[PDB]
Amino acid sequence: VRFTGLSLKQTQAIEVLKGHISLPDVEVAVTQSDQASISIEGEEGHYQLTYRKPHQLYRALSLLVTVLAEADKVEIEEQAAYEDLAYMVDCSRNAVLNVASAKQMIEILALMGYSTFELYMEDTYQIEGQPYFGYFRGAYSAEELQEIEAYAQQFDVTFVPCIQTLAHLSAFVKWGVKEVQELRDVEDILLIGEEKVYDLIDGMFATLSKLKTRKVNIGMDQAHLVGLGRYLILNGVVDRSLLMCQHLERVLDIADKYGFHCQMWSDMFFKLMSADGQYDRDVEIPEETRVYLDRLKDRVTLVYWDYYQDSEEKYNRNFRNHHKISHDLAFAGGAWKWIGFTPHNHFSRLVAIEANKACRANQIKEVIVTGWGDNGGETAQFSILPSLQIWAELSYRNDLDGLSAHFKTNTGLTVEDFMQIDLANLLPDLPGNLSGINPNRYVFYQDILCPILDQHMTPEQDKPHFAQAAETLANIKEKAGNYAYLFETQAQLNAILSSKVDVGRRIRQAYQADDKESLQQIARQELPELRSQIEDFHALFSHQWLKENKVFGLDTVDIRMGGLLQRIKRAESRIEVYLAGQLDRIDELEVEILPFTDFYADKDFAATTANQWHTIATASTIYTT
């Protein structure tokens, strides 16, 4: 590859990206031009490449590599619909992306066309004088954040931290020392009005001000009981919509002190000013709150977040609700990686297509693609690359015609192969448009003796689905190069699910039929083999985790999986005592299984959504007193 017109910075960036893409032997003249986000023209090995914004050079090169495998003549012109496209990684659900993996992620985002990289850190960044904040969580040092940001800057990608300045601070506020307890209202919510809370928040911005970036998402989502705990005890009943504004104004003043411009999640305005306390509502704004908001709206960008709607109209409705408060809006979409071990790129594609229509219809300047890790971070950080390419394609081209070819240029895999990563969730009888259906997770963590999700299993279809999935994924692993770990992990999981999906039911059928030879088989052969496979899964999972994340947080998985293993040993031992005639009855097996949840009771399929480890694993108490 011969380039003319590059700076040293750009030539060095390109050197890094040769680790992902193969530049052919051609001559490319490069310039900045406002004419297009990306333009590439020329033929017979001599090409002219222009970008509007510096970071767009890297997507241009991915396009160039792609189209030259196909043809000698190139006519590319792209007009991105969004001023900014960002990817936000969850670093608060136990999985803290390690620095080396943050660098890989940045490289890929740059090839895809993202302008912005973001980390969501509730308590997982260090604040001077707050030793419990992020303690044993692998909180990023200021230096690590600076290194990560500086790396992104190598590709003209900007960095935006997503923090919390109200709720979602559960891992911090649990620490039973006065310096932390005095900051609390209730649950995971900080105490509005308490000066020590504003000292903490000032501390958050002092840390962040060590970065170059002056753009921040301050959070403030899901503070459902705000003003109703220690706040209510100290101050009595207040208008909670005004309370939100008072808090918001204090935080904005602190941001201003450090020169930051803020975004925030939008949901609490709607929840606190709607009759049934929900996000998706047209709001009745009390006049005093309307006056307060009118002055605050000019100082903050509201982020409408929605990972769920299957149609443009549903989004547009919410955009119209938001316009009643502000026209300075951004949108946050979803790269589904928060439903256990296995992502849902398929569902992500479905909703992105529709969200992109709505966002364009409402002149949304910025889309933030979110990669949440709900309830323990058990899905791989790189599991959702197809979703990321999907949104990039939608911004730059408004279609997916180039999705797989650009994807294979950037990763070595076709997007279709990569999206087989979803397989543990893709039961055949599901419609593609319902969210959160996560058998990958609940089949895995379910008990043996007390299988409380058993009514949601359909062994005739599920067993061969999982078995075939494991074979499909082993084949993809062998051609996945450096992405192999992802597929190996999923293959082993599907192998486990193919038998575990009904082992609990088979134990009960054998018990009821008095088939003792079968119980003996299950206790002495199948369940010990099940433990061996789970330990193999745990090893693969640990390799995956340690490759992507800091070690901190893996401990919760160690605990969860060690518990599962011990519960399988209980199944073995209880069966043995019964077979030895030292029990008349196995009481666990005498209990009739009820539906776990009725959330999809009306549908013809049996699967469901169950995404809390502690209620998957047992009907007993385990965290409560």
Of 53 and 505, the one with the shorter C-beta distance to its own copies is 505
Binding mask 320-359 for ligand NGA (x = CB under 6 A): ------------------x---------------------
Q: Give the three-state DSSP class for 166.
A: coil
DSSP letters of 372-413? --TTT--S-TTTTHHHHHHHHHHHHHSSSTTHHHHHHHHHSS
* Dihedral, 530, 532, 535, 541 alpha carbons, nearest 10: -70
Contacts for 620 with CB less than 8 Å, ≥ 6 apart: none
Burial class (CB in 10 A: 0-12, 13-18, 19+), 187: middle
175 touches which of ligand NGA, its own copies, none (CB within 5 to 8 A by kind)? its own copies
Chosen from its own copies, ligand NGA, none, partner binding at 598 (C-beta under 5 to 8 Å by type): its own copies
For the bound state, the minimum distance from the C-beta of residue 141 to ligand NGA, rounded and expressed in Å, comes to 24
Q: What tokens were used for 306?
A: 């929605």
Q: Which of 82, 305, 319, 347 contacts ligand NGA by CB under 6 A?
A: 305
End-to-end, the C-alpha distance of the chain in Å comes to 66
- Taking the C-alpha atoms of residue 40 and residue 50, their distance in angstroms, rounded to an integer, is 6
Binding mask 374-393 for ligand NGA (x = CB under 6 A): x-------------------
Q: What's phi and psi for 49, nearest 5 deg?
A: -125, 130
Which of 197, 52, 31, 226 has the alpha carbon at shortest distance from 127? 197
Question: Out of ligand NGA, its own copies, none, which partner does residue 553 contact, by CB within 5 to 8 A per kind?
Answer: its own copies
Cβ-based nearer residue to its own copies, 129 or 136: 136
Kindly tell me the burial class for residue 328, based on how many C-beta atoms sit within 10 Å of its own C-beta (0-12, 13-18, 19 or more).
middle
Q: Which residue pairs, CB below 8 angstroms and at least 24 apart, start in 65-68?
A: 65/21, 65/22, 65/23, 65/24, 65/409, 66/402, 66/405, 66/406, 66/409, 67/40, 68/24, 68/26
CB nearer to ligand NGA: give 222 or 241. Answer: 222
Q: Which of its own copies, ligand NGA, none does 305 bind, CB closer than 5 to 8 A by kind?
A: ligand NGA
Nearer to its own copies, 233 or 291 (CB): 233
CA nearest to 474, candidates 451, 494, 453: 494
CB-based contacts of 191-197 (< 8 A; 24+ apart in sequence): 191/230, 191/231, 191/234, 192/166, 192/226, 192/227, 192/231, 192/243, 192/246, 192/247, 193/231, 193/234, 193/235, 193/246, 193/247
Q: Which does 597 bind (CB under 5 to 8 A by kind): ligand NGA, its own copies, none?
A: its own copies
Q: Report how many residues bind ligand NGA under the rule CB under 6 A.
A: 9
Residue 554 interaction partner, one of ligand NGA, its own copies, none, beta carbon < 5-8 Å per kind: its own copies
Stretch that binds ligand NGA, among 4-12, 285-293, 369-377, 531-539 (CB under 6 A): 369-377
**Backbone phi and psi for residue 248, each to the nearest 5 degrees, phi listed first:** -50, -50
Backbone angles phi, psi at 28, to 5 degrees: -130, 115
Distance CA 293, CA 281 (A): 17
Q: Which residues 253-272 are close enough to bind ligand NGA by CB under 6 A? A: 265
Closest approach of its own copies to the CB of residue 447, in Å: 7
Mask: binding to ligand NGA, 218-257, rule CB under 6 A, as x and -?
A: ---xx-----------------------------------
Q: How far is the CB of 523 from ligand NGA (least distance, A)?
A: 37
Q: Which is nearer to its own copies, 68 or 449 (CB)?
A: 449
Q: Is 315 in the site for ligand NGA (CB under 6 A)?
A: no
* Min CB(148)–ligand NGA separation in Å: 21
Q: Does 372 bind ligand NGA (CB under 6 A)?
A: yes
Task: List the single partner that 563 binds among its own copies, ligand NGA, none, CB under 5 to 8 Å by kind.
Answer: its own copies
- Residue 237 Cβ, how far from its own copies at the closest point, in Å? 6
| Residue 526 DSSP symbol | I
Site for ligand NGA in 396-435 (CB under 6 A): none
624 binds, among its own copies, ligand NGA, none (CB under 5 to 8 A by kind): its own copies
Nearer residue to its own copies within complex by CB, 203 or 563: 563
Sole window of 223-231, 368-376, 383-391, 459-467 interacting with ligand NGA (rule: CB under 6 A): 368-376
CA 423 to chain centre: 17
Instruction: Please give the Cα distance from 495 to 497 (Å, whole number).
Output: 6
187 binds ligand NGA (CB under 6 A): no
Nearest to ligand NGA of 397, 441 (CB atom): 441
Length of the chain counted residue by residue = 625
Residue 249's alpha-carbon distances to 32, 127, 274, 475, in angstroms, are 40, 22, 22, 55
Residues near ligand NGA, by CB under 6 A: 221-222, 265, 305, 338, 370, 372, 374, 625
